[PDB]
């Protein structure tokens, strides 16, 4: 047959690329020598094209102007801190070790100094649970208990823009506009609606996959479609 859409994606051609030349910045935490003697002031709030959420421009003492992953409740004029001794307040960044248990945080680093990997989407947040000298236990947005190096930095509070998902797109045109700001091919043609040559589910007088949808983890690309290695399907049981 012909390569399926999922395979065309990988070549990274324009149709599948994100409009990076239009993106603003990668909200990674600032790098501090130590001391925590680094503070800045929120100079403005902006829209982040890549995440459909707001971001805050901060001017730091040492003259560095950078965009930051803003939690809810950060406004212009406010002063933020980044360091071990940073004050424990919304919008401030410091290593999990310094963060008091039971405090919601976002933009959590995976490995100390990486800049932040977890809980960055609209209105989300990780929940710092257990402390220790060897491991900090955080509960990520998906509900998974994650063991992290207490040296991993994080921002106090939940991410701005919460509830974005509560409003329906209502029309195709709205979906359209959002999709144009992401690395995605949209709209979506169902596999069952294509010719046999174009997809494992194509072909047949009437539409229907001529096979079970749960595909094995070991299936090669081109064949791994439908419900990948599902542990189960449906709503029952």
């Amino acid at each position: 047959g012909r390569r399926i859409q999922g395979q065309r994606r990988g070549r990274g051609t324009s149709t599948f690329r994100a409009p990076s030349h239009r993106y603003k910045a990668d909200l990674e935490h600032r790098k501090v020598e130590d001391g925590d003697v680094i503070a800045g002031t929120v100079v403005d709030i902006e829209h982040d094209p890549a995440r459909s959420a707001p971001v805050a421009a901060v001017e730091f003492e040492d003259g560095d102007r950078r965009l930051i992953l803003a939690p809810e409740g950060v406004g212009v004029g406010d002063e933020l801190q980044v360091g071990v001794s940073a004050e424990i307040a919304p919008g401030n960044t410091l290593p999990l070790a310094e963060i008091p248990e039971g405090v919601p945080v976002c933009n959590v680093e995976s490995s100390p100094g990486d800049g932040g990997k977890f809980a960055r989407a609209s209105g989300v947040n990780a929940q710092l649970l257990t402390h220790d000298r060897n491991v900090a236990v955080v509960k990520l947005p998906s509900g998974e208990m994650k063991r992290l190096d207490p040296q991993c930095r994080a921002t106090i509070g939940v991410v701005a823009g919460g509830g974005r998902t509560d409003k329906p797109f209502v029309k195709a045109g709205n979906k359209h506009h959002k999709m144009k700001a992401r690395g995605t091919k949209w709209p979506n043609v169902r596999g069952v609606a294509m010719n046999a040559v174009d997809h494992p589910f194509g072909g047949g007088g009437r539409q229907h996959p001529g096979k079970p949808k749960s595909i094995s983890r070991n299936a090669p690309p081109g064949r791994k479609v439908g419900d990948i290695a599902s542990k189960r399907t449906g709503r029952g049981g």
């Binding site: 709030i45 805050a56 939690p71 809810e72 406004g75 004029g77 919601p104 939940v158 823009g161």
Partner: protein
């Protein structure tokens, strides 16, 4: 409200749009001062026409349930 949607989309879709936008455009109490002059400027961006305080909040509400949690703990 969803009246601009005419007889399209159906109840639910345009019922939520109405409510969400109804609460979205209400006068909101500014965290800076105390006046009900906060208006949305864009997605998750709010500002007070009185004192000019520009800040981040929910997408359609200036404060979200989870956002109000942080304060506590």
């Amino acid at each position: 409200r969803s009246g601009r949607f005419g007889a399209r989309y159906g109840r639910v879709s345009r019922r939520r749009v109405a409510e969400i936008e109804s609460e979205m455009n209400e006068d909101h109490a500014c965290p800076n001062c105390g006046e009900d002059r906060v208006d949305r400027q864009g997605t998750g961006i709010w500002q007070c026409s009185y004192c000019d305080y520009k800040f981040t909040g929910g997408s359609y509400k200036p404060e979200t349930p989870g956002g109000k949690t942080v304060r506590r703990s």
